[PDB]
Amino acid sequence: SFRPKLYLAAPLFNEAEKESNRNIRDSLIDCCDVFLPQEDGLLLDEPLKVAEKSIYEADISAMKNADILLAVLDGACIDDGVAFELGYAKAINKVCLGFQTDVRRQAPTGNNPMIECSCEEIFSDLGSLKKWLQQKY
C-alpha cells in the first residue's frame, strides 16, 4: 500500500476543536499514519518554559518525520501555531495541504497569500482530501 505519514496541525484549545481533530484523524487512518499533537503526551496546561520547550521539540520532530502537513485553517483567525508549523514544513519541502470548512476569512479576498499559496490544495471536505491523496500516490 505504502502509508504516507501525515502531521495534523490544528488548534486544540477547547473540546470542540479536540473532538474535531479526532474526527479528521479517524477519517484518514485507513490511508495514512497520523501524528496528532493533542495525543502526543505533551500538552501545555496539564515546568513552564521546559514544558514549552518539550512541546516545541516534539512538534518539530514529528514535522520532520512526516511526509504531509495538513493545516486546519478554521477559526476566528488562523491559529499562530498552525501557521508557524505550515511555514516550517513548507521550508523543509513537505507536501503542504489546508483543511478549511469555516466561512470566515482574513479579508474578503480570501486567506493570507502566505497560507493560500503554500497549500498545494485547500480542502473543504474530507472526501476530496482522501481522493486527492490517493491520486498523488
Q: Can you tell me the distance from the alpha carbon of 18 to that of 1, in angstroms, rounded to the nearest whole number?
A: 29
What is the nearest approach in angstroms of its own copies to the Cβ of residue 118?
6
What is the nearest approach in angstroms of its own copies to the Cβ of residue 125?
9
Between the two ends of the chain, the Cα-to-Cα distance in Å is: 10
**Which three three-digit cell numbers place residue 52?**
514549552
What is the nearest approach in angstroms of its own copies to the Cβ of residue 44?
6
Residues β-bridged to residue 110: 107
Taking a C-beta distance cutoff of 8 angstroms, is the pair 33, 67 a contact?
Answer: no
Where do contacts with its own copies occur on this chain (CB under 8 A)? 11, 13-17, 19-20, 44-45, 48, 51-53, 55-56, 59, 74-92, 101-118
26 vs 137, beta carbon nearer its own copies: 26
127 vs 134, beta carbon nearer its own copies: 127
